[PDB]
């Protein structure tokens, strides 16, 4: 029954409904142009109707709003079922008071089930080390005293998505102890977990020169990057341990995003009734890591979700579903692997 506080599940708060938000945000979504496609593509959009949503799967909870109190209660109950102690919240620097309100709603709901919340800092517009520092300060100031705000050994933790978009010479200003705008040894110090993507020849000096406290791999699709190739995890962990870094590999139950990225079929990983998830989670446990991240709770666009899904067919699309498993199988199977992780941690 114990929640695991070193298990981080990537959570997305960007869904809307007509009733609450005035539109089906994110269930409606632009279709992405082919990066190798022509010059003047008109890929179109997915309208977020009942029949047609921007996922290859279909949520048991329907086209829900992330601000709906009833949905938040259910999501937190699902985290309890999964034994996942930390919700890693996507964060886009929206700046509007309604972002703040929603963050406040998630924190309050989480705390009722003793779930903790940390922030997943996304590549928001014009993100750089100066406004990153500004934002880290604001988040710690605004939410640091909330009982659900995550700390590891007294420290906040931030995952930094696509951290490679900012060079190490920039990162060092923020993350070196001698950095010109350093957070080290200040009230705003935190564990900063950057994204390990490619080969060790590039990633090792990146992580060292950028002064990240750790790294994660994010991608649910095996082999999409060097970092998301689980046979690499034992050597990645040995390097991390040698260099005083926290390795948080990311595990997922599958991947498919061809509703929003029709050209991206090569990245599909079928779930094969839970077999894919089992193989991946087992690999993370075997690498002897001290923490695990799960991609994802509810990234519906990318079909990596462990949130319950239902069989559904419409005139628009035949949705995938969990096959010979119940809608809540990925939640309970996550609990199973969390228990195994705890036993040998
Ligand atoms: O949370 C990290 C990462 C996970 N995958 C999606 C990334 O966002 C991008 O893709 C989604 C659709 O899956 C779009 O809605 C976003 O606008 C796009 O930036 C996200 O950064």
PDB file of N, CA and C in Angstrom, residues 154-215:
ATOM      1  N   UNK A 154      15.442  17.167   1.530  1.00  0.00           N
ATOM      2  CA  UNK A 154      15.369  18.625   1.654  1.00  0.00           C
ATOM      3  C   UNK A 154      15.379  19.423   0.353  1.00  0.00           C
ATOM      4  N   UNK A 155      15.670  18.796  -0.785  1.00  0.00           N
ATOM      5  CA  UNK A 155      15.802  19.535  -2.044  1.00  0.00           C
ATOM      6  C   UNK A 155      14.623  19.347  -3.000  1.00  0.00           C
ATOM      7  N   UNK A 156      14.123  20.451  -3.597  1.00  0.00           N
ATOM      8  CA  UNK A 156      13.206  20.302  -4.737  1.00  0.00           C
ATOM      9  C   UNK A 156      13.900  19.586  -5.891  1.00  0.00           C
ATOM     10  N   UNK A 157      13.099  19.051  -6.804  1.00  0.00           N
ATOM     11  CA  UNK A 157      13.614  18.357  -7.959  1.00  0.00           C
ATOM     12  C   UNK A 157      12.876  18.862  -9.187  1.00  0.00           C
ATOM     13  N   UNK A 158      13.625  19.082 -10.267  1.00  0.00           N
ATOM     14  CA  UNK A 158      13.058  19.496 -11.540  1.00  0.00           C
ATOM     15  C   UNK A 158      13.590  18.588 -12.627  1.00  0.00           C
ATOM     16  N   UNK A 159      12.685  18.083 -13.476  1.00  0.00           N
ATOM     17  CA  UNK A 159      13.087  17.426 -14.724  1.00  0.00           C
ATOM     18  C   UNK A 159      13.130  18.500 -15.798  1.00  0.00           C
ATOM     19  N   UNK A 160      14.183  18.510 -16.608  1.00  0.00           N
ATOM     20  CA  UNK A 160      14.283  19.499 -17.686  1.00  0.00           C
ATOM     21  C   UNK A 160      14.181  18.840 -19.044  1.00  0.00           C
ATOM     22  N   UNK A 161      13.034  18.997 -19.693  1.00  0.00           N
ATOM     23  CA  UNK A 161      12.840  18.357 -20.994  1.00  0.00           C
ATOM     24  C   UNK A 161      13.628  19.061 -22.104  1.00  0.00           C
ATOM     25  N   UNK A 162      14.187  18.270 -23.018  1.00  0.00           N
ATOM     26  CA  UNK A 162      15.011  18.797 -24.119  1.00  0.00           C
ATOM     27  C   UNK A 162      16.081  19.797 -23.623  1.00  0.00           C
ATOM     28  N   UNK A 163      16.739  19.441 -22.522  1.00  0.00           N
ATOM     29  CA  UNK A 163      17.752  20.322 -21.945  1.00  0.00           C
ATOM     30  C   UNK A 163      18.893  20.630 -22.929  1.00  0.00           C
ATOM     31  N   UNK A 164      19.125  19.748 -23.898  1.00  0.00           N
ATOM     32  CA  UNK A 164      20.136  19.976 -24.931  1.00  0.00           C
ATOM     33  C   UNK A 164      19.906  21.226 -25.777  1.00  0.00           C
ATOM     34  N   UNK A 165      18.712  21.811 -25.724  1.00  0.00           N
ATOM     35  CA  UNK A 165      18.448  23.061 -26.460  1.00  0.00           C
ATOM     36  C   UNK A 165      19.158  24.275 -25.839  1.00  0.00           C
ATOM     37  N   UNK A 166      19.807  24.076 -24.696  1.00  0.00           N
ATOM     38  CA  UNK A 166      20.541  25.139 -24.022  1.00  0.00           C
ATOM     39  C   UNK A 166      21.950  24.583 -23.805  1.00  0.00           C
ATOM     40  N   UNK A 167      22.977  25.293 -24.283  1.00  0.00           N
ATOM     41  CA  UNK A 167      24.353  24.778 -24.257  1.00  0.00           C
ATOM     42  C   UNK A 167      24.877  24.711 -22.828  1.00  0.00           C
ATOM     43  N   UNK A 168      25.846  23.817 -22.567  1.00  0.00           N
ATOM     44  CA  UNK A 168      26.479  23.661 -21.243  1.00  0.00           C
ATOM     45  C   UNK A 168      27.096  24.957 -20.708  1.00  0.00           C
ATOM     46  N   UNK A 169      27.651  25.794 -21.588  1.00  0.00           N
ATOM     47  CA  UNK A 169      28.226  27.064 -21.129  1.00  0.00           C
ATOM     48  C   UNK A 169      27.125  27.995 -20.576  1.00  0.00           C
ATOM     49  N   UNK A 170      25.894  27.865 -21.086  1.00  0.00           N
ATOM     50  CA  UNK A 170      24.746  28.525 -20.452  1.00  0.00           C
ATOM     51  C   UNK A 170      24.338  27.879 -19.124  1.00  0.00           C
ATOM     52  N   UNK A 171      24.096  26.561 -19.140  1.00  0.00           N
ATOM     53  CA  UNK A 171      23.769  25.816 -17.930  1.00  0.00           C
ATOM     54  C   UNK A 171      24.712  26.098 -16.766  1.00  0.00           C
ATOM     55  N   UNK A 172      26.015  26.166 -17.043  1.00  0.00           N
ATOM     56  CA  UNK A 172      26.965  26.409 -15.946  1.00  0.00           C
ATOM     57  C   UNK A 172      26.736  27.718 -15.182  1.00  0.00           C
ATOM     58  N   UNK A 173      26.222  28.745 -15.857  1.00  0.00           N
ATOM     59  CA  UNK A 173      25.916  30.020 -15.164  1.00  0.00           C
ATOM     60  C   UNK A 173      24.893  29.765 -14.072  1.00  0.00           C
ATOM     61  N   UNK A 174      23.995  28.821 -14.350  1.00  0.00           N
ATOM     62  CA  UNK A 174      22.907  28.503 -13.438  1.00  0.00           C
ATOM     63  C   UNK A 174      23.286  27.434 -12.423  1.00  0.00           C
ATOM     64  N   UNK A 175      24.026  26.428 -12.882  1.00  0.00           N
ATOM     65  CA  UNK A 175      24.179  25.171 -12.130  1.00  0.00           C
ATOM     66  C   UNK A 175      25.578  24.877 -11.580  1.00  0.00           C
ATOM     67  N   UNK A 176      26.593  25.563 -12.081  1.00  0.00           N
ATOM     68  CA  UNK A 176      27.918  25.485 -11.419  1.00  0.00           C
ATOM     69  C   UNK A 176      27.881  26.176 -10.071  1.00  0.00           C
ATOM     70  N   UNK A 177      28.609  25.648  -9.067  1.00  0.00           N
ATOM     71  CA  UNK A 177      28.698  26.404  -7.806  1.00  0.00           C
ATOM     72  C   UNK A 177      29.320  27.803  -7.993  1.00  0.00           C
ATOM     73  N   UNK A 178      30.193  27.963  -8.984  1.00  0.00           N
ATOM     74  CA  UNK A 178      30.774  29.270  -9.289  1.00  0.00           C
ATOM     75  C   UNK A 178      30.049  30.039 -10.403  1.00  0.00           C
ATOM     76  N   UNK A 179      28.857  29.578 -10.787  1.00  0.00           N
ATOM     77  CA  UNK A 179      28.119  30.191 -11.903  1.00  0.00           C
ATOM     78  C   UNK A 179      27.631  31.608 -11.617  1.00  0.00           C
ATOM     79  N   UNK A 180      27.644  32.455 -12.647  1.00  0.00           N
ATOM     80  CA  UNK A 180      27.315  33.878 -12.495  1.00  0.00           C
ATOM     81  C   UNK A 180      25.894  34.168 -12.018  1.00  0.00           C
ATOM     82  N   UNK A 181      24.948  33.257 -12.265  1.00  0.00           N
ATOM     83  CA  UNK A 181      23.597  33.387 -11.715  1.00  0.00           C
ATOM     84  C   UNK A 181      23.209  32.097 -10.958  1.00  0.00           C
ATOM     85  N   UNK A 182      24.152  31.549 -10.194  1.00  0.00           N
ATOM     86  CA  UNK A 182      23.982  30.222  -9.654  1.00  0.00           C
ATOM     87  C   UNK A 182      22.801  30.101  -8.685  1.00  0.00           C
ATOM     88  N   UNK A 183      22.175  28.927  -8.680  1.00  0.00           N
ATOM     89  CA  UNK A 183      21.202  28.586  -7.633  1.00  0.00           C
ATOM     90  C   UNK A 183      21.865  27.728  -6.550  1.00  0.00           C
ATOM     91  N   UNK A 184      23.082  27.257  -6.798  1.00  0.00           N
ATOM     92  CA  UNK A 184      23.750  26.379  -5.826  1.00  0.00           C
ATOM     93  C   UNK A 184      23.976  27.134  -4.531  1.00  0.00           C
ATOM     94  N   UNK A 185      23.730  26.473  -3.402  1.00  0.00           N
ATOM     95  CA  UNK A 185      23.935  27.096  -2.083  1.00  0.00           C
ATOM     96  C   UNK A 185      23.096  28.339  -1.868  1.00  0.00           C
ATOM     97  N   UNK A 186      21.938  28.413  -2.526  1.00  0.00           N
ATOM     98  CA  UNK A 186      20.958  29.470  -2.267  1.00  0.00           C
ATOM     99  C   UNK A 186      19.653  28.812  -1.808  1.00  0.00           C
ATOM    100  N   UNK A 187      18.685  29.630  -1.405  1.00  0.00           N
ATOM    101  CA  UNK A 187      17.362  29.147  -1.012  1.00  0.00           C
ATOM    102  C   UNK A 187      16.650  28.411  -2.149  1.00  0.00           C
ATOM    103  N   UNK A 188      17.128  28.595  -3.382  1.00  0.00           N
ATOM    104  CA  UNK A 188      16.467  28.076  -4.559  1.00  0.00           C
ATOM    105  C   UNK A 188      17.226  26.919  -5.200  1.00  0.00           C
ATOM    106  N   UNK A 189      18.149  26.303  -4.453  1.00  0.00           N
ATOM    107  CA  UNK A 189      18.912  25.166  -4.961  1.00  0.00           C
ATOM    108  C   UNK A 189      17.946  23.978  -5.157  1.00  0.00           C
ATOM    109  N   UNK A 190      18.257  23.098  -6.101  1.00  0.00           N
ATOM    110  CA  UNK A 190      17.360  21.978  -6.420  1.00  0.00           C
ATOM    111  C   UNK A 190      18.148  20.900  -7.126  1.00  0.00           C
ATOM    112  N   UNK A 191      17.596  19.692  -7.171  1.00  0.00           N
ATOM    113  CA  UNK A 191      18.156  18.652  -8.008  1.00  0.00           C
ATOM    114  C   UNK A 191      17.633  18.922  -9.413  1.00  0.00           C
ATOM    115  N   UNK A 192      18.558  19.054 -10.363  1.00  0.00           N
ATOM    116  CA  UNK A 192      18.218  19.354 -11.746  1.00  0.00           C
ATOM    117  C   UNK A 192      18.557  18.142 -12.585  1.00  0.00           C
ATOM    118  N   UNK A 193      17.531  17.546 -13.165  1.00  0.00           N
ATOM    119  CA  UNK A 193      17.656  16.301 -13.894  1.00  0.00           C
ATOM    120  C   UNK A 193      17.494  16.609 -15.382  1.00  0.00           C
ATOM    121  N   UNK A 194      18.564  16.482 -16.158  1.00  0.00           N
ATOM    122  CA  UNK A 194      18.507  16.823 -17.567  1.00  0.00           C
ATOM    123  C   UNK A 194      18.239  15.595 -18.438  1.00  0.00           C
ATOM    124  N   UNK A 195      17.899  15.828 -19.696  1.00  0.00           N
ATOM    125  CA  UNK A 195      17.569  14.734 -20.598  1.00  0.00           C
ATOM    126  C   UNK A 195      18.799  14.143 -21.255  1.00  0.00           C
ATOM    127  N   UNK A 196      19.079  12.877 -21.015  1.00  0.00           N
ATOM    128  CA  UNK A 196      20.097  12.154 -21.732  1.00  0.00           C
ATOM    129  C   UNK A 196      19.503  11.553 -23.002  1.00  0.00           C
ATOM    130  N   UNK A 197      19.970  12.026 -24.122  1.00  0.00           N
ATOM    131  CA  UNK A 197      19.492  11.550 -25.386  1.00  0.00           C
ATOM    132  C   UNK A 197      20.445  10.560 -26.086  1.00  0.00           C
ATOM    133  N   UNK A 198      21.551  11.065 -26.600  1.00  0.00           N
ATOM    134  CA  UNK A 198      22.430  10.333 -27.480  1.00  0.00           C
ATOM    135  C   UNK A 198      23.573   9.539 -26.856  1.00  0.00           C
ATOM    136  N   UNK A 199      24.615   9.289 -27.608  1.00  0.00           N
ATOM    137  CA  UNK A 199      25.710   8.482 -27.126  1.00  0.00           C
ATOM    138  C   UNK A 199      26.514   9.094 -25.965  1.00  0.00           C
ATOM    139  N   UNK A 200      27.178   8.263 -25.182  1.00  0.00           N
ATOM    140  CA  UNK A 200      28.009   8.749 -24.078  1.00  0.00           C
ATOM    141  C   UNK A 200      29.085   9.758 -24.499  1.00  0.00           C
ATOM    142  N   UNK A 201      29.591   9.656 -25.732  1.00  0.00           N
ATOM    143  CA  UNK A 201      30.621  10.605 -26.200  1.00  0.00           C
ATOM    144  C   UNK A 201      30.114  12.046 -26.132  1.00  0.00           C
ATOM    145  N   UNK A 202      28.853  12.256 -26.490  1.00  0.00           N
ATOM    146  CA  UNK A 202      28.230  13.581 -26.349  1.00  0.00           C
ATOM    147  C   UNK A 202      27.603  13.839 -24.948  1.00  0.00           C
ATOM    148  N   UNK A 203      26.840  12.868 -24.431  1.00  0.00           N
ATOM    149  CA  UNK A 203      26.044  13.072 -23.200  1.00  0.00           C
ATOM    150  C   UNK A 203      26.874  13.187 -21.929  1.00  0.00           C
ATOM    151  N   UNK A 204      27.954  12.414 -21.830  1.00  0.00           N
ATOM    152  CA  UNK A 204      28.775  12.475 -20.625  1.00  0.00           C
ATOM    153  C   UNK A 204      29.338  13.871 -20.358  1.00  0.00           C
ATOM    154  N   UNK A 205      30.056  14.462 -21.335  1.00  0.00           N
ATOM    155  CA  UNK A 205      30.517  15.834 -21.088  1.00  0.00           C
ATOM    156  C   UNK A 205      29.364  16.847 -20.967  1.00  0.00           C
ATOM    157  N   UNK A 206      28.230  16.602 -21.632  1.00  0.00           N
ATOM    158  CA  UNK A 206      27.092  17.530 -21.517  1.00  0.00           C
ATOM    159  C   UNK A 206      26.634  17.633 -20.074  1.00  0.00           C
ATOM    160  N   UNK A 207      26.374  16.476 -19.484  1.00  0.00           N
ATOM    161  CA  UNK A 207      25.879  16.397 -18.121  1.00  0.00           C
ATOM    162  C   UNK A 207      26.910  16.982 -17.142  1.00  0.00           C
ATOM    163  N   UNK A 208      28.178  16.623 -17.318  1.00  0.00           N
ATOM    164  CA  UNK A 208      29.266  17.129 -16.464  1.00  0.00           C
ATOM    165  C   UNK A 208      29.455  18.645 -16.625  1.00  0.00           C
ATOM    166  N   UNK A 209      29.595  19.108 -17.863  1.00  0.00           N
ATOM    167  CA  UNK A 209      29.812  20.543 -18.128  1.00  0.00           C
ATOM    168  C   UNK A 209      28.609  21.411 -17.827  1.00  0.00           C
ATOM    169  N   UNK A 210      27.410  20.833 -17.901  1.00  0.00           N
ATOM    170  CA  UNK A 210      26.206  21.613 -17.571  1.00  0.00           C
ATOM    171  C   UNK A 210      25.942  21.594 -16.085  1.00  0.00           C
ATOM    172  N   UNK A 211      26.631  20.708 -15.349  1.00  0.00           N
ATOM    173  CA  UNK A 211      26.449  20.605 -13.877  1.00  0.00           C
ATOM    174  C   UNK A 211      25.027  20.187 -13.442  1.00  0.00           C
ATOM    175  N   UNK A 212      24.379  19.331 -14.238  1.00  0.00           N
ATOM    176  CA  UNK A 212      23.144  18.658 -13.798  1.00  0.00           C
ATOM    177  C   UNK A 212      23.437  17.727 -12.642  1.00  0.00           C
ATOM    178  N   UNK A 213      22.486  17.627 -11.719  1.00  0.00           N
ATOM    179  CA  UNK A 213      22.589  16.675 -10.615  1.00  0.00           C
ATOM    180  C   UNK A 213      22.273  15.257 -11.088  1.00  0.00           C
ATOM    181  N   UNK A 214      21.629  15.127 -12.243  1.00  0.00           N
ATOM    182  CA  UNK A 214      21.213  13.808 -12.703  1.00  0.00           C
ATOM    183  C   UNK A 214      20.681  13.873 -14.114  1.00  0.00           C
ATOM    184  N   UNK A 215      20.180  12.728 -14.597  1.00  0.00           N
ATOM    185  CA  UNK A 215      19.606  12.633 -15.916  1.00  0.00           C
ATOM    186  C   UNK A 215      18.498  11.599 -15.996  1.00  0.00           C
TER     187      UNK A 215
END
